[PDB]
């Protein structure tokens, strides 16, 4: 079973988006008004699930094949790959990376999405994989389209892929969104702008990666993920 053998660098909650960001309208009623209560790290916070023994299907990371209903999905074929490291630069191996997204037209395969853009009969929009022993992950997918949403009267999400990363503990677990290099919708989005620091926003923008492309086949984007720094305990209880 798990042991308490490490500590995680405290989060910078001015680097992360704050809870109350009123231009993103749903945050107004879904943000705590009381301060968070700080607690010391214990075994409860410094451990978490490892997914090495979860059974992955052969196409779990390949969205071009994992919802196959007689053909290929329509859209810009892309590899999305990168490395998960911690804040000390140490790779995070054998960690769970999950992702979900709309199709090439900005339509989600979810019963609550009523956008008029059609579903793609060969696209589901969900992937998962475990990082390798050096911290690398990769998915194959199509580039999602922007999509309009009922925030302001003419608001559109930039093209984006949702990510969840487990990391070594529940203290490291993160959900975020990947955006694409150069997309002019990025500076306009109130969800992007929930992040106050422009440098933090830049950390969410995947870069075109021609080195990783398959010629005559698919392009590639690179998105590296940094989880909280992990260190050994020192000088505790003395």
């Amino acid at each position: 079973p798990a042991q308490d053998n490490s500590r995680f660098v405290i989060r910078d909650r001015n680097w992360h988006p704050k809870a109350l960001t009123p231009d993103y309208k749903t945050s107004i009623a879904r943000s705590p008004r009381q301060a968070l209560v700080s607690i010391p790290q214990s075994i409860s916070e410094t451990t978490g699930p490892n997914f090495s023994h979860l059974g992955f299907g052969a196409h779990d990371h390949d969205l071009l094949l994992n919802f196959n209903n007689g053909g290929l999905p329509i859209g810009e074929r892309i590899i999305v790959a990168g490395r998960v490291v911690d804040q000390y630069g140490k790779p995070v191996p054998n960690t769970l990376v999950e992702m979900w997204q709309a199709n090439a037209g900005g339509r989600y395969r979810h019963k609550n999405d009523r956008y008029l853009a059609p579903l793609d009969p060969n696209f589901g929009g969900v992937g998962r994989c475990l990082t390798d022993s050096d911290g690398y992950y990769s998915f194959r997918t199509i580039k999602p389209g922007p999509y309009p949403w009922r925030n302001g009267p003419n608001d559109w999400r930039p093209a984006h892929i949702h990510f969840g990363i487990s990391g070594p503990s529940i203290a490291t677990k993160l959900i975020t969104q990947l955006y694409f290099e150069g997309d002019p919708l990025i500076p306009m989005c109130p969800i992007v702008k929930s992040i106050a620091n422009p440098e933090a926003v830049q950390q969410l923008i995947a870069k075109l990666d021609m080195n990783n492309a398959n010629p005559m086949d698919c392009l590639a984007y690179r998105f590296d993920i940094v989880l909280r720094g992990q260190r050994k305990t020192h000088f505790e209880n003395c």
Binding site: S27, R109, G164
Partner: protein, 200 residues
């Protein structure tokens, strides 16, 4: 000062989180193995319990698109981190609110006591992380049990909450669902009876 690489910033999971993390609930086919809300096989050691709850916004309305992750010790106070659908017990699970009733459920065992880093026993608890549309960075909380009053009163984590009235927001209420032992843990994100949320 020493500045490390900055952590990747959080974003909301959004209202379609279920596509990626709760496939059934999205209305979609599941894969062979899924991480879900049954932590204990029927013969896992300990007292088998149902946990359930609803999530409220600052207007007192149900948050029908909540996604929750839980982490708890087994009945012997051990954290089982080697996740496997074949395990008798997994310390990790996921759940989500139904869109109709707004109610989540988890099938588990009552966790055993674990010590904090100073060696002081913590009262039995489940660690919870809450994600949803409108929530930019997930909210951490703990579910404790109303039939552990003696332990709760001495818990070094509950004692870090300055006001006793606020400690009460983390105490789940023992009840019965279809005749079976259950505890209800409602979360109020904002306002009257606002649930304590943690940073660590």
């Amino acid at each position: 000062p020493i500045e490390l690489l900055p952590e990747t910033p959080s974003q909301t999971a959004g209202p379609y989180v279920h596509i990626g993390l709760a496939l059934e609930a999205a209305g979609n086919p599941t894969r062979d193995q899924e991480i879900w809300n049954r932590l204990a096989k029927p013969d896992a050691p300990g007292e088998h319990i149902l946990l359930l709850g609803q999530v409220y916004d600052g207007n007192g309305h149900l948050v029908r698109d909540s996604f929750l992750e839980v982490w708890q010790a087994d009945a012997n106070g051990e954290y089982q981190d080697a996740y496997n659908l074949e395990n008798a017990f997994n310390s990790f699970g996921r759940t989500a609110t139904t869109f109709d009733a707004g109610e989540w459920t988890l099938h588990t065992v009552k966790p055993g006591v674990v010590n904090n880093a100073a060696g002081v026993p913590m009262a039995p608890h489940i660690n919870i992380s809450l994600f949803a549309r409108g929530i930019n960075i997930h909210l951490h909380t703990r579910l404790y049990f109303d039939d552990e009053a003696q332990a709760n009163a001495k818990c070094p984590v509950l004692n870090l909450i300055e006001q006793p009235q606020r400690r009460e927001t983390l105490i789940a209420k023992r009840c019965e669902v279809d005749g079976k032992t259950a505890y209800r843990f409602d979360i109020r994100i904002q306002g009257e009876g606002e649930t304590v949320f943690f940073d660590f």
